[PDB]
Design a protein around this ligand. Structure first.
Ligand SMILES: [K+]
Ligand SMILES: [K+]
Ligand SMILES: [K+]
Ligand SMILES: [K+]
Ligand SMILES: [K+]
Ligand SMILES: [K+]
Ligand SMILES: [K+]
Ligand SMILES: [K+]
Ligand SMILES: [K+]
Ligand SMILES: [Mg+2]
Ligand SMILES: [Mg+2]
Ligand SMILES: [Mg+2]
Ligand SMILES: [Mg+2]
Ligand SMILES: [Mg+2]
Ligand SMILES: [Mg+2]
Ligand SMILES: [Mg+2]
Ligand SMILES: [Mg+2]
Ligand SMILES: [Mg+2]
Ligand SMILES: [Mg+2]
Ligand SMILES: [Mg+2]
Ligand SMILES: [Mg+2]
Ligand SMILES: [Mg+2]
Ligand SMILES: [Mg+2]
Lengths: 99, 101, 114, 127, 151, 82
RNA sequence: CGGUCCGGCCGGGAACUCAAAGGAGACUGCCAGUGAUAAACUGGAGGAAGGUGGGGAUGACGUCAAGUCAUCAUGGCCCUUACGACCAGGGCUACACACGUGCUACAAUGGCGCAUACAAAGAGAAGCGACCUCGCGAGAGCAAGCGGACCUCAUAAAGUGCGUCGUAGUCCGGAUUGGAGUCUGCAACUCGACUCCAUGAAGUCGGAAUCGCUAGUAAUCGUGGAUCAGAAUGCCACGGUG
């Protein structure tokens, strides 16, 4: 088969050390790996009133960036499966993997 | 924001989850276009008012979780714009830095 | 020339000609001329008399003249004697469909009175 | 071989392949008169190719994405000029004087808070 | 403009003719960013100026433009609450700018059907020194000669 | 308007007119239900409709059918400015 | 390049567009001239960009006993079978008037009809909801796909081509009112949005006065989001023409 792995996080340093962890766990265990590719980063904006009572035109603008990385895996061995299910990832990376 | 106004809100969502999203059957199934369009649909329209004046998610004012403010709400955070800003500058909301594009 | 609507219209195109008939807008006028079989860019000069009471025959299928004015005037007096909320806005001179009267009720109230 | 150029204007992006010899310009598998109805857009895509003289000497295969009419036509002209400077490289210094080498960096200014537009302010009254 | 005295932006020539003064004339005619609408009005007006009333088309356009260009205008000068009207010579950049602005505004307030035929009448009035775009020029020239003492 | 699949009336008003249907003319029926539509079944009754502070009596005639009860009880008092 | 049902749709390619990580680039660095052997100014070359390249964020000591005890917190005062608490209905939408901020107009650089081009930035699971069938229409029925560079919202409008209207209170304007509907919701009377038919006010460019803008700006044309069951001419964003 191919197994597809999506990574999303709020930081880009933390997300591509996490991809570097899973591209090098996967041909250390001996599989061709496809990627990693950066998908477009979805940025969500917010705009608040800062004053407790009036003054409409005084505002702040904030943002959350969600970075995305995609790795496809070519050669899903038995050794490859038990390697990258038991890996030491950080608290900021969300993983959702595809069969 | 007036302890009773929050208790009115806490009671409203707890009583809304009590009936609706479970027994929305009274209008989503019987008030349909087929052979139930006889008296059984009409008794369904009558039966919908036996349930309390609450129960409906259209009476949720959806206030802030800390202060209980009814205005300036943000559904992403659950907090008012005063408390979103006060906690974002403290670094409490993850990934929320000041936007400048 | 004149119709069963016994207004005397223009010598412009017929689809604007029948709009001068009270009770016929543009959709009704397009439905008259399509059922009478006569094109829209055709004036009522070039329209001979066999083509004009085929229009009077077709216009007579709607409630269109001062006979409709009676139907409109019965609609308003009925509310003005029912004593409902719409009749109170009608018998007085204030807007009926729930618009702002603090400002800008000016077409209903006439020019302003200091 | 194909000689290539990339040009862009406001939000448009054009790739340009030039091929040695004839006068066929085809754009998004349509030719110039079918794509650009406006004569001004036809002229500015022609413009780099009359300082360099090309009667029917270069086939141009161009595609373009994004923007509008004048954005795409300026993105083509910037893409042609980069392809011709790849083509012989002696063309640069007269193409500089014509101002065609400059990437036009004029972007739309963002809307600002408190303002009706990028710079339009609401109507002020003293009282 | 206190401190940063600037250059100026360079514009395209007209596509059909290679004219940069017609490109300025289409710009002055243009309303709300509609350039394609305004080129069709000028080209319609320049044709019916050329073909109905003597050829040599943009040769005829400057014959109409020569007859509305002012040579001396007036400008205020504030001293003590009594501010004089002093005649000043007009720059040739401003000469074309004032002539084309007076012709467009003359052609706007006519009663004919199209805009191109209002423009065509105003250019044929100006080529023969009549109309109202010419009379804006001598009204400026009358006022300049009236205040000639303040040179 | 409300759509064609069912006019609205409250049940406490529907039962109260039902017992004035058979048992005859009464005192005017006190109600707070201004949002109910007037049925055929109510011609001849007097419904006292609440308007915020009082109950205004409404004698039902045949042209009131299909209207709301709140239309015959004005909630705002106003008579001239100056 | 092969093949094709002529759609990158298949084989395939990693060039190009683009995506997002890393790096390079602009410093008055270089060349003249002016300058007090100065700091700095004018001009030129090269360059994608030149002198703060464009825009944003970033707001010194302080001023106005400026604003907020109704976001929250808090000193003092006051209420404690009520100034606390629950419920139904009404009200915040009243209307002789005056003012502020907007939207749409008074048309021909336009209105209407048919045909046909070119965007960006977003949102979505009690959600976005395609195809097909029914309805003039708002919508309805059925139901795929999508937690999304994949699916949907979602066919951008100004523009361009052809035809018509021919300077009129009009084929301009769409206020008001009548009738018939749809959807959301326990519930649209007071007091929702939208659709169809009919109605077709004022308005023909605005007194004294006054506002915004120095370039991708003004002007004009559409698109999206937050709030939100439903309910923008407001607010916050985005591109087109210019
Ligand atoms: K009519
Ligand atoms: K206090
Ligand atoms: K109310
Ligand atoms: K009202
Ligand atoms: K407005
Ligand atoms: K105003
Ligand atoms: K309502
Ligand atoms: K009309
Ligand atoms: K909503
Ligand atoms: Mg609500
Ligand atoms: Mg309203
Ligand atoms: Mg814009
Ligand atoms: Mg404002
Ligand atoms: Mg103010
Ligand atoms: Mg590569
Ligand atoms: Mg004070
Ligand atoms: Mg209540
Ligand atoms: Mg209010
Ligand atoms: Mg759709
Ligand atoms: Mg007029
Ligand atoms: Mg400035
Ligand atoms: Mg418009
Ligand atoms: Mg908007």
């Amino acid at each position: 088969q191919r197994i597809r792995i999506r990574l999303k996080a709020f930081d880009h340093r933390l997300i591509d050390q996490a991809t570097a962890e899973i591209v090098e766990t996967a041909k250390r265990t001996g599989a061709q790996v496809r990627g990693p590719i950066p998908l477009p980063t979805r940025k969500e904006r917010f705009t608040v009133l800062i004053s407790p009572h009036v003054n409409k035109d005084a505002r702040d603008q904030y943002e959350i960036r969600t970075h995305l990385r995609l790795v496809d895996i070519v050669e899903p061995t038995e050794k490859t499966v038990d390697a990258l299910m038991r890996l030491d990832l950080a608290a900021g990376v969300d993983v959702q993997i595809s069969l | 924001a007036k302890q009773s106004m929050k208790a009115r809100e806490v009671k409203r969502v707890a009583l809304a989850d009590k009936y609706f999203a479970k027994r929305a059957e009274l209008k989503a199934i019987i008030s349909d276009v087929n052979a139930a369009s006889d008296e059984d649909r009409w008794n369904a329209v009558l039966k919908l008012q036996t349930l309390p004046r609450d129960s409906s998610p259209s009476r949720q004012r959806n206030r802030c979780r800390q202060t209980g403010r009814p205005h300036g709400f943000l559904r992403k955070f659950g907090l008012s714009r005063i408390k979103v800003r006060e906690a974002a500058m403290r670094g409490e909301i993850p990934g929320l830095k000041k936007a400048s594009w | 020339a004149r119709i069963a609507g016994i207004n005397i219209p223009d010598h412009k195109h017929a689809v604007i000609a029948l709009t001068s008939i009270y009770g016929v807008g543009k959709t009704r006028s397009k439905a008259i001329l399509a059922a009478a079989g006569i094109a829209e860019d055709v004036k009522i000069s070039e329209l001979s008399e066999g083509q004009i009471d085929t229009l009077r025959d077709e216009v007579a299928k709607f409630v269109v003249e001062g006979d409709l004015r009676r139907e409109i005037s019965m609609s308003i007096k009925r509310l003005m004697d029912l004593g409902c909320y719409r009749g109170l806005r009608h018998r007085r001179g204030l807007p009926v469909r729930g618009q702002r009267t603090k400002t800008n009720a000016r077409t209903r109230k006439g020019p302003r009175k200091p | 071989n194909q000689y290539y150029g990339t040009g862009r204007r406001k939000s448009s992006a054009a790739r340009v392949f030039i091929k040695p010899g004839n006068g066929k310009i085809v754009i998004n598998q349509r030719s110039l008169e079918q794509y650009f109805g406006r004569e001004t857009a036809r002229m500015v895509v022609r413009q780099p190719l009359e300082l360099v003289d090309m009667v029917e000497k270069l086939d141009l295969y161009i595609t373009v994405k994004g923007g509008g009419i004048s954005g795409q036509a300026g993105a083509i002209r910037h893409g042609i000029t980069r392809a011709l400077m790849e083509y012989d490289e002696s063309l640069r210094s007269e193409l500089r004087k014509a101002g065609f080498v400059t990437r036009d960096a004029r972007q739309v200014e963002r809307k600002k808070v408190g303002l009706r537009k990028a710079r339009r302010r609401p109507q002020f009254s003293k009282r | 403009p206190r401190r940063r005295v600037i250059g100026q932006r360079k514009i395209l020539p007209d596509p059909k003719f290679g004219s940069e003064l017609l490109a300025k004339f289409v710009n002055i005619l243009m309303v709300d960013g509609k350039k394609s609408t305004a080129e069709s009005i000028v080209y319609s007006a320049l044709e019916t100026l050329a073909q109905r009333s003597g050829k040599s088309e943009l040769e005829a356009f400057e014959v109409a433009l020569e007859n509305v260009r002012p040579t001396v205008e007036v400008k205020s000068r504030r001293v003590g609450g009594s501010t004089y009207q002093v005649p000043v010579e007009v720059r040739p950049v401003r000469r074309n700018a004032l002539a084309m602005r007076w012709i467009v505004e003359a052609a706007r307030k006519r009663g004919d059907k199209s805009m191109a035929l209002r423009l065509a009448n105003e250019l044929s009035d100006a080529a023969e020194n009549k109309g109202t775009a010419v009379k804006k020029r001598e009204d400026v020239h009358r006022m300049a000669e009236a205040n000639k003492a303040f040179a | 308007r409300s759509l064609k699949k069912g006019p609205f009336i409250d049940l406490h008003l529907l039962k109260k007119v039902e017992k004035a249907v058979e048992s005859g003319d009464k005192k005017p029926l006190r109600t707070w239900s201004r949002r109910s539509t007037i049925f055929p079944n109510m011609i001849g009754l007097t419904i006292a409709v609440h308007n915020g502070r009082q109950h205004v009596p409404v004698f039902v005639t045949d042209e009131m059918v299909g209207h709301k009860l709140g239309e015959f009880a004005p909630t705002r008092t106003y008579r001239g400015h100056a």
